[PDB]
């Protein structure tokens, strides 16, 4: 949103581009998108249309900037049988042109009954100077709704770097010098080795269990019993019924 600082905006966009798992990024059209250069997304959905022509133009230009590297599909959601269909058809350009013809004071302008009927009967580029009072009207309305509701990072790292032990500082210098060794991890396609090792182990286990069964057979070939208790020999009489 616009309340996220520029550094936060860059951090969040870099995180979105880096983490391929994030499925959607939701952005405010009023956020200064002009600070986001690269977007690794191929689909843009406009939930609602901005009434400010300058902001709509900025959003369109931004969507065009992303499309320089890949084909993009842009979807505009519009509520049928609502004012949104008319605002999609003609935007605010005709309204601003009509009000500008009556003068520079938008607070005292009156709209023609035909325009009102065309907008509300539900079933050439405008320069920013001409749109400014309209934008100030929009701002005024938004603020009225709001009234209805109503040490540098480098110095921090320097303090942190000063708390590191000498061996940690050496490790820092070593990793900085070996900039070509950021791939120190032995990442390899372990799956193939696992696929072969599983079969080799299954065979080893089959062999070991066969040898165990053979040893048990040898142990059973040996005599099982050679002695019996004194009670069975003399203290009891064997009977059959």
């Amino acid at each position: 949103d616009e309340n996220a600082s520029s550094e936060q905006r860059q951090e969040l966009m870099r995180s979105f581009n880096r983490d391929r798992r994030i499925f959607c990024a939701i952005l405010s059209t009023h956020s200064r998108t002009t600070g986001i250069n690269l977007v690794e997304a191929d689909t843009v959905v406009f939930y609602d249309n901005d009434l400010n022509p300058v902001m709509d133009a900025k959003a369109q230009e931004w969507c065009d900037r992303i499309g320089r590297c890949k084909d993009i599909h842009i979807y505009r959601l519009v509520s049928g049988n609502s004012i949104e269909e008319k605002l999609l058809k003609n935007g605010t350009k005709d309204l601003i042109r009509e009000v500008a013809a009556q003068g520079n004071d938008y607070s005292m302008a009156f709209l023609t009954q035909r325009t009102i009927q065309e907008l509300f009967e539900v079933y050439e580029t405008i320069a920013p100077k001409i749109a400014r009072p309209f934008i100030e009207a929009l701002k005024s309305i938004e603020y009225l709704e709001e009234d209805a509701q109503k040490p540098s990072q480098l110095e921090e790292l320097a303090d942190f770097m000063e708390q590191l032990t000498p061996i940690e500082k050496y490790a820092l210098n070593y990793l900085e010098l070996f900039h070509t060794s950021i791939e120190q991890e032995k990442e390899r396609n372990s799956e193939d080795a696992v696929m072969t090792a599983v079969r080799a182990w299954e065979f080893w286990n089959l062999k070991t269990l066969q040898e165990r069964e053979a040893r048990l057979r040898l142990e059973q070939e040996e005599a099982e019993l050679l002695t019996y208790t004194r009670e069975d020999a003399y203290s009891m009489e064997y009977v059959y019924e």
Binding site: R14, N17, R18, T180, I182, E183, E185, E187
Partner: peptide, 17 residues
Amino acid sequence: LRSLETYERLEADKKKQ
């Protein structure tokens, strides 16, 4: 490329981390 990877090494480093 190693210098450029300071910006473009988005894939390998994130995957290993």
